[PDB]
C-alpha cells in the first residue's frame, strides 16, 4: 500500500493511525542553529518519523515504505539509502521489484549519485546484469553525457565482461554526435580493454577513422584529442607520414587544432634526435607564436611557456 508522496490524498505520517504508536524524533539542530533549513511540513514530518524508526532500528515493512518517501524528499540522503538497504535484506524484499523501483527513480533523478550506487549494489546482489546495457542506453538517449550513466556502463561491462557489442554502440552514438567526448572516451575504454592499440591493424583503423572525422568536422576537438591520445603514447615522431598528411590540411582543414598538433609532433621530434633540429625548432616556435598572438590567444600563457621550454631544451 504505497500512498504516493504526490497523491492528492497523501496524509502526514502523524495523521496516520498505523503509525500512532511510535513517537516522532525531531531534529536536534541545537539551541543556536546555523545553515538551518526551514523544512516544509511534509519534509519535516517524514524525517521525524524516519529518525524514530532508525533510532529504534525498527526493521519493519512500514519502515521500508517510509524510507521511500524520505528518499523522494531528498535522494541525496545517504543515511536513508543505507537503512533502506538494511531493510531490503532483513525483510527479504524481492530485489527485482526493487530494480523496478530504482529504474524509475533514476529516470527521474539521473544525476544523483545515491540512486546509481544503489542500482550497482542491487546488480551485485542479484549477480544479474541482463537489464543494464539497455537501461543505461535509455538514460543516454536522454542525456548522452551523463557521467554516472557512463560510469555505470563501464562497471557492468568490466565486471560481467560484456565487451562484444560496445564498440558498435560507440559507433552508433558517434554518428548521433561526433562531438560527444564521453563516447570518444568509451571508444578508448573498449579498445584498450579488448584488442589494445599495439595491434598495428587496429591502430591503423583508428587513426584512419579519426582522420575522416576530422575531415568532416575540423573544429571538433574530441577527434583531435583522441588522435593525440592514441599516438602520443608511442611518440608522435614514430609516425613520419602523419606530419606530412596534416601539413596538407594546412589550407583546407586548418583549425588551431592542426596548428597545435604540429607543435606536438615537433616537440617529440626534438626529444627524439630529429634531423634538421635547428630548422624544426624554429617552426615549432613560429607556430607557438602564431598560437600565442593570433590563433589561440586564450592559451597565450601556455603557448609562451611552450615556446620558452622548447628553447631552453633544444637551443
Amino acid at each position: 500500500g504505497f500512498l504516493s508522496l504526490d497523491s492528492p490524498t497523501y496524509v502526514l505520517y502523524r495523521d496516520r493511525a498505523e503509525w500512532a504508536d511510535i513517537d516522532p524524533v525531531p531534529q536536534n539542530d541545537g539551541p543556536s542553529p546555523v545553515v538551518q533549513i526551514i523544512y516544509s511540513e511534509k519534509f519535516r514530518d517524514v524525517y521525524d518519523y524516519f529518525r524514530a524508526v532508525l533510532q529504534r532500528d525498527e526493521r519493519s515493512e512500514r519502515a521500508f515504505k517510509l524510507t521511500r518517501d524520505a528518499i523522494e524528499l531528498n535522494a541525496a540522503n545517504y543515511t536513508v539509502w543505507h537503512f533502506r538497504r538494511v531493510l531490503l535484506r532483513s525483510l527479504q524484499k524481492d530485489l527485482q521489484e526493487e530494480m523496478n523501483y530504482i529504474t524509475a527513480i533514476i529516470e527521474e533523478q539521473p544525476k544523483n549519485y545515491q540512486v546509481w550506487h544503489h542500482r550497482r549494489v542491487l546488480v551485485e546482489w542479484l549477480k544479474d546484469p541482463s537489464q543494464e546495457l539497455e537501461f543505461i542506453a535509455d538514460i543516454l538517449n536522454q542525456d548522452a553525457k551523463n557521467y554516472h550513466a557512463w560510469q555505470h556502463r563501464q562497471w557492468v561491462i568490466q565486471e560481467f565482461r560484456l565487451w562484444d557489442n560496445e564498440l558498435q554502440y560507440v559507433d552508433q552514438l558517434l554518428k548521433e554526435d561526433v562531438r560527444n567526448n564521453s563516447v570518444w572516451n568509451q571508444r578508448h575504454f573498449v579498445i584498450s580493454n579488448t584488442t589494445g592499440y599495439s595491434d598495428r591493424a587496429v591502430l591503423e583503423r583508428e587513426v584512419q577513422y579519426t582522420l575522416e572525422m576530422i575531415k568532416l568536422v575540423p573544429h571538433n576537438e574530441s577527434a583531435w584529442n583522441y588522435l593525440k591520445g592514441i599516438l602520443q603514447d608511442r611518440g608522435l615522431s614514430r609516425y613520419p607520414n602523419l606530419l606530412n598528411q596534416l601539413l596538407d590540411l594546412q589550407p583546407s582543414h586548418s583549425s588551431p587544432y592542426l596548428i597545435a598538433f604540429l607543435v606536438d609532433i615537433y616537440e617529440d621530434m626534438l626529444e627524439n634526435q630529429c634531423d634538421n633540429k635547428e630548422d624544426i625548432l624554429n617552426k615549432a616556435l613560429e607556430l607557438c607564436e602564431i598560437l600565442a598572438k593570433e590563433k589561440d590567444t586564450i592559451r597565450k600563457e601556455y603557448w609562451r611557456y611552450i615556446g620558452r621550454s622548447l628553447q631552453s631544451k633544444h637551443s
Binding site: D29, R51, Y147, E221, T297
Partner: protein
C-alpha cells in the same frame, strides 16, 4: 576588457556546418554570453567591472543562519553549506563574530560521528564529503574551540575503515569509490596531522590510474577526464608529495584546453559547457602545476602569471556570473546558490593572485575593490588558515592507538 575587443568576435564557435546536440548547445551559450558582453555598447554606458560585495555579503550572512525549503536537497550536506558560506565570507574579507563561530562549532559537533568523521547533519552517518567540509570550516574559524571539535583518533580510525587494498578510499561505509574520497582523506589527515606511514599506501598509484588518454583525470580508472575529479586527483598528490606520478605535461595541456576561447571561463570536460564553478576546479590546477613543475626546477615557468588567461576568466566571472540580488552562478540564466558563490569567488581569487617563491603578482580586473583575499590552491581555505591549522595540530602527535 579582453572579451569586448572586436577581434574577440572571431572566437565564436565554428560548427563546420555540421550541427549536433553539442554544437547547438554551445551556440546557445555563446549567443547568451555575447548579449551580456555587448550590453554596454547597446545601452551606451562605460563597462564597469564591479564585484557586488555588499550584495554577496547579505546573501551569505543570511544563508549562514537559515535557508528556505529550496535547500531541502542539501539536508544531507549541511557541513558543506557552512564551508561554502564561511569560505565565501573569508574571501570577501568578512570576519566571523565569535558568537557565530561558536554556533558553527557546536553544529559541526552534532554532525560529528562517535565513530570518527562527520555526517551531513545532526545524527547522519559519517561520510567523507561532509567530513572534508566540516574540517575545512573549522579551520577557517581557526579557534582552539574549533580545532578541539575534531576527535582526531576517531577520525584516523574512520579513514582506515574506508581505506581499500588497491589504495582507494570509499566515500563512506557501504559506499562508492572515486578520486574525491582520496582528496577528502588526504586533506583532513594532513590538516589534522593524523597521517600514519601506511595510511595512504598505494593511493598515489590508484589516483595515477585515473589519468586517461586526455591528460585529465576521471572519477575512477577508465572514466572521461573531468575538472572536478582532476583537481581532487592532483591536489591529493601534492599533499602526498607524489605529483610526479602523473604525466604533468599532458595534464597541463588538458586543463589549459578547457578554457573557452569565447566565454573566457572553464568547461568541465571537453565539448561541454562553460560553468563558473570551474573557475576553481580547473583554474585552481594551474597554481598546483606551477608549484610541481617548479619543484622539478622548470626554467620556462612564468614569474608573474598562471598558465591560463587570468583576464578572460575574471571577465567571465564578473560580467557573466554575478546575480544582481547577491550570490554568484553557473552561467547567465542560472539560479544563484552557495556552491557557485564559493567557487566563483574562489576562482576569482586564484585569477587575481600569483605567487612563486618570492614572486607575487596580482591582476585585478575592474574596480580595485574587486581584489579578494587569497586562497590556498590545495585546501581552498585561506593560506593563513592552513599554516595556522597544521601548526596547531602538529602540537599533537599522530594517533598511535
Amino acid at each position: 576588457l579582453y572579451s569586448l575587443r572586436p577581434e574577440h568576435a572571431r572566437e565564436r564557435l565554428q560548427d563546420d556546418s555540421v550541427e549536433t546536440v553539442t554544437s547547438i548547445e554551445q551556440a546557445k551559450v555563446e549567443e547568451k554570453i555575447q548579449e551580456v558582453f555587448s550590453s554596454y555598447k547597446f545601452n551606451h554606458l562605460v563597462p564597469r567591472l564591479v564585484l557586488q560585495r555588499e550584495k554577496h555579503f547579505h546573501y551569505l550572512k543570511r544563508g549562514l543562519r537559515q535557508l528556505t525549503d529550496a535547500y531541502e536537497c542539501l539536508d544531507a550536506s549541511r557541513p558543506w553549506l557552512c564551508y561554502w558560506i564561511l569560505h565565501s565570507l573569508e574571501l570577501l574579507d568578512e570576519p566571523i563574530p565569535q558568537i557565530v563561530a561558536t554556533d558553527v562549532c557546536q553544529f559541526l559537533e552534532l554532525c560529528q560521528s562517535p565513530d570518527g568523521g562527520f555526517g551531513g547533519g545532526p545524527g547522519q552517518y559519517p561520510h567523507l564529503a561532509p567530513t572534508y567540509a566540516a574540517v575545512n570550516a573549522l579551520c577557517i574559524i581557526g579557534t582552539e574551540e574549533a580545532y578541539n571539535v575534531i576527535n582526531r583518533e576517531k577520525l584516523l580510525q574512520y579513514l582506515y575503515s574506508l581505506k581499500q587494498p588497491d589504495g582507494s578510499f570509499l566515500m563512506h561505509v557501504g559506499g562508492e569509490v572515486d578520486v574525491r574520497s582520496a582528496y577528502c582523506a588526504a586533506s583532513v589527515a594532513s590538516l589534522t596531522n593524523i597521517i600514519t606511514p601506511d595510511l595512504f599506501e598505494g593511493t598515489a598509484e590508484w589516483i595515477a590510474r585515473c589519468q586517461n588518454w586526455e591528460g585529465g583525470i576521471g572519477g575512477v580508472p577508465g572514466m572521461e577526464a573531468h575538472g572536478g575529479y582532476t583537481f581532487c586527483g592532483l591536489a591529493a598528490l601534492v599533499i602526498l608529495k607524489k605529483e610526479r606520478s602523473l604525466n604533468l605535461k599532458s595534464l597541463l595541456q588538458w586543463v589549459t584546453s578547457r578554457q573557452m576561447r569565447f566565454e573566457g571561463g572553464f568547461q568541465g570536460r571537453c565539448n561541454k559547457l562553460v560553468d563558473g564553478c570551474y573557475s576553481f576546479w580547473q583554474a585552481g590546477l594551474l597554481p598546483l602545476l606551477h608549484r610541481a613543475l617548479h619543484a622539478q626546477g622548470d626554467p620556462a615557468l612564468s614569474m608573474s602569471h598562471w598558465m591560463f588567461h587570468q583576464q578572460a576568466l575574471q571577465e567571465y566571472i564578473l560580467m557573466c556570473c554575478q546575480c544582481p540580488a547577491g550570490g554568484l552562478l553557473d552561467k547567465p540564466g542560472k539560479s544563484r546558490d552557495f556552491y557557485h558563490t564559493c567557487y566563483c569567488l574562489s576562482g576569482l581569487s586564484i585569477a587575481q593572485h600569483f605567487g612563486s617563491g618570492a614572486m607575487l603578482h596580482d591582476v585585478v580586473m575592474g574596480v580595485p575593490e574587486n581584489v579578494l583575499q587569497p586562497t590556498h590552491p590545495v585546501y581552498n581555505i585561506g593560506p593563513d588558515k592552513v599554516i595556522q591549522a597544521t601548526t596547531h595540530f602538529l602540537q599533537k602527535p599522530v594517533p598511535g592507538f
